[PDB]
Design a protein around this ligand. Structure first.
Ligand SMILES: Nc1nc2c(ncn2[C@@H]2O[C@H](COP(=O)(O)OP(=O)(O)OP(=O)(O)OC[C@H]3O[C@@H](n4cnc5c(N)ncnc54)[C@H](O)[C@@H]3O)[C@@H](O)[C@H]2O)c(=O)[nH]1
Ligand SMILES: Nc1ncnc2c1ncn2[C@@H]1O[C@H](CSCC[C@H](N)C(=O)O)[C@@H](O)[C@H]1O
Ligand SMILES: [Mg+2]
Ligand SMILES: [Zn+2]
Ligand SMILES: [Zn+2]
Ligand SMILES: [Zn+2]
Lengths: 514, 133
């Protein structure tokens, strides 16, 4: 008897605090006023009219169920539900060195973003009349691995600044991506502590002048705000956070992270420490294969990419069949039967690694590796449509996403891959030219076999319904201007199209013979 | 490294963490009480003659057979959670004075300081009680 936190542990070097009034807690009042487990006022031994005591902000431990108030730590599941609301956060720090000892101050903060904010050591200090948020002495940690920290003591910046810079750097990174934040962290304790500086909490609130729930708070004038519509807002209103390590990994963060991802080399800097936390987060989550029960609402124009995507597929897989007349088409990566050109004489064989259960009688269960299968499909044509892999086989029609492009749709991942979210977030390997060694790029073209039916335009490339003439034929002249639009779009969605080399625009005209 | 001197006991951990973070500390507390959660304990409690004025804010403990007595700043929520004080600048009511509470109401001293306010007439509790008004 008895146990203690210490949260708010007194870090001052004063022996003998504290008068029974101006003593925060019974626990600390000088032995001198204590008797029989009580305290008593002795006018003889006065209260000090001047003192400064550093109160430790470490050990925050918040789990409480209060009806109007949101759990700020979320389940792995609910965390997936919001992905890239995700941000990696790891704070490096410094210890209080002179007028006091025994606590940790937030020296440098870093993020999944490249950003590193450094702050002047500051802490919470008890005086006679109040608590006061104030600059403090500090020193860098002992380790030789912490030597990179030394100069940052001078570097800046006041906390009143830093919590403002934080909210913007967050505001503009999350504005179009999400309605909330989730901080993704490896050793959560210190970062929770760091949070006390910028983060205010409370029951859900709708942003001033907007429909959407509030991200930010400004003390300058009591208000709440929104990811987009905040500015000069100092505090974050209801962040969420997930501790990755709580999923029971074996070692230190870099140990596990590096098992999977080789693209992030470590320089002990906070950012880099907080990036490696997202990787693991992403890998241990989305490189398991493509769970389809998870629905990510779209903003925006995923639909116009979605349609424009199928449209282009059908067009080229129809043509490619006409052109070289393949006996069989090997469709690799088709969970559901779903012939893309529904009417073709061709044997249509399906292969996928995770075939949807109904429609599993139609499909062979298969995992394609060029090492193993470069032999195994010779006859006919192979279709890899957003089935990303070990380098593609010589006879193939493929669509691979190029990770390098950025859009609010696609997020960073491991290792160098990107997690792509349209619906059912799709993690894709990083773009590798070696994949395409056997293929060649797909030049743009149009094909329509039909009867013909605002200003007309001639196109060197469309094998067209009617080319005897110009021939702008008002029905295809419209459709070709529409299918080139939706093709120009999916290209800017980052996607690329790669075909077997033999393929020739020409052979499509011989289907016009009779 | 500890390496330091401990101010607080665990049974107040969650409760304090809450209001430290909250935008409105007052609400957060009253609510935590609603949710069925335990009130802040560990306040400095005064061994007293129990004869004296009934007044709430005094420079030395003054109690009634009705009241029990507390070192003020442990009964202060803002003082206890180490966050800014509701007075605009900057200062506390209860730090450096003793606060009095009715023995029945005494279970939740931190709260009682929020819930009520002192008559500027008799310097005594309003309703718990006061002769004025
Ligand atoms: N970087 C990556 N992007 C991917 C991946 N898979 C899909 N995508 C892209 O995200 C989007 C996700 O596809 P989604 O399944 O959510 O779109 P749809 O709602 O339009 O498909 P369905 O309505 O369920 O039906 C489509 C059927 O059409 C075929 N299909 C399936 N995928 C496609 C695409 N991408 N383009 C054209 N046609 C496609 C296939 O037979 C399908 O069964 C899509 O736009 C693609 O651009 C992927 O593994 N990596
Ligand atoms: N290396 C591989 N070998 C076989 N199937 C793979 C694979 N990599 C991914 N897949 C499968 O391909 C699918 C990726 S979704 C791609 C969608 C498909 N082109 C369509 O028309 O909708 C998943 O079912 C996954 O199980
Ligand atoms: Mg950490
Ligand atoms: Zn990585
Ligand atoms: Zn106070
Ligand atoms: Zn009165």
């Amino acid at each position: 008897a008895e146990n203690v936190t210490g949260l708010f542990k007194d870090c001052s070097k004063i022996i003998t605090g504290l008068h029974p009034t101006q003593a925060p807690t019974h626990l600390s009042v000088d032995i001198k006023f204590k008797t029989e487990g009580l305290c008593v006022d002795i006018p003889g031994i006065p209260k000090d009219m001047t003192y400064r005591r550093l109160i430790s902000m470490m050990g925050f431990k918040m789990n409480y169920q209060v009806n109007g108030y949101p759990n700020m730590f979320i389940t792995r599941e609910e965390a997936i539900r919001h992905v890239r609301a995700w941000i990696g956060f790891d704070v490096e720090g410094c210890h209080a060195t002179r007028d006091a000892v025994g606590t940790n101050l937030p020296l440098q903060l870093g993020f999944s973003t490249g950003v590193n904010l450094v702050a002047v050591p500051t802490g919470y200090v008890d005086t006679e009349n109040n608590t006061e948020f104030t600059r403090v002495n500090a020193k860098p940690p002992p380790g030789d691995q912490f030597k990179h920290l030394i100069p940052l003591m001078y570097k800046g910046l006041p906390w009143n600044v830093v919590r403002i810079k934080i909210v913007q750097m967050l505001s503009d990174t999350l504005k179009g991506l999400s309605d909330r934040v989730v901080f993704v962290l490896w050793a959560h304790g210190f970062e929770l502590t760091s949070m006390k500086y910028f983060v205010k909490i409370g029951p859900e609130r709708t942003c001033c002048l907007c429909d959407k729930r509030a991200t930010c708070f400004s003390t300058s004038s009591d208000t709440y705000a929104c990811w987009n519509h905040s500015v000069g807002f100092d505090y974050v209103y209801n962040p969420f956070m997930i501790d990755v390590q709580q999923w029971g990994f074996t070692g230190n963060l870099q140990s596990n992270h590096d098992q999977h991802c080789q693209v992030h080399g470590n320089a002990h800097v906070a950012s880099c420490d907080a990036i490696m936390t997202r990787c693991l987060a992403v890998h241990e989550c989305f490189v398991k294969r493509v769970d389809w029960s998870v629905e990510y609402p779209i903003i925006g124009d995923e639909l116009r990419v979605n349609s424009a995507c199928r449209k282009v597929q059908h067009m080229v897989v129809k043509s490619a069949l006409l052109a070289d007349k393949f006996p069989v088409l090997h469709d690799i990566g088709n969970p559901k039967a779903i012939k893309c050109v529904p009417q073709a004489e061709v044997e249509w064989k399906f292969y996928d690694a995770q075939p949807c259960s109904d429609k599993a009688y139609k499909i062979e269960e298969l995992f394609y590796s060029y090492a193993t299968h470069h032999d195994k499909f010779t006859d006919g044509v192979c279709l890899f449509w957003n089935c990303n892999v070990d380098r593609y086989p010589a006879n193939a029609i493929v669509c691979r996403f190029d990770t390098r492009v950025l859009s609010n749709l696609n997020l960073p991942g491991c290792d160098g891959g990107s997690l792509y979210v349209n619906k059912h977030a799709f993690h894709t390997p990083a773009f590798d030219k070696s994949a395409f060694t056997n293929l060649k790029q797909l030049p743009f073209f149009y094909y329509s076999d039909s009867p013909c039916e605002y200003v007309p335009l001639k196109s060197a490339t469309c094998i067209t319904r009617c080319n005897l003439g110009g021939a702008v034929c008002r029905h295809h002249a419209n459709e070709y201007r529409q299918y080139l639009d939706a093709y120009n779009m999916m290209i800017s969605a980052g996607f690329s199209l790669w075909i077997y080399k033999q393929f020739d625009t020409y052979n499509l005209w011989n289907t016009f013979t009779r | 490294g500890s390496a330091g001197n401990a101010t607080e006991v665990p049974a107040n951990s969650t409760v304090l963490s809450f209001c430290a973070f909250a935008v409105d500390p007052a609400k957060a507390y009253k609510d935590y009480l609603a949710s069925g959660g335990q009130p802040i304990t560990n306040c400095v409690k005064m061994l007293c003659t129990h004869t004296g004025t009934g007044q709430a804010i005094t420079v030395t403990p003054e109690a009634n057979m009705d009241q029990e007595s507390f070192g003020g700043a442990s009964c202060c929520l803002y003082c206890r959670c180490h966050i800014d004080h509701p007075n605009p600048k900057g200062f506390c009511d209860l730090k450096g004075k003793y606060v009095q509470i009715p023995t029945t109401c005494a279970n939740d001293p931190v709260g009682f300081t929020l819930r009520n306010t002192v008559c500027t007439v008799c310097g005594m509790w309003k309703g718990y009680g006061c002769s004025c008004d």
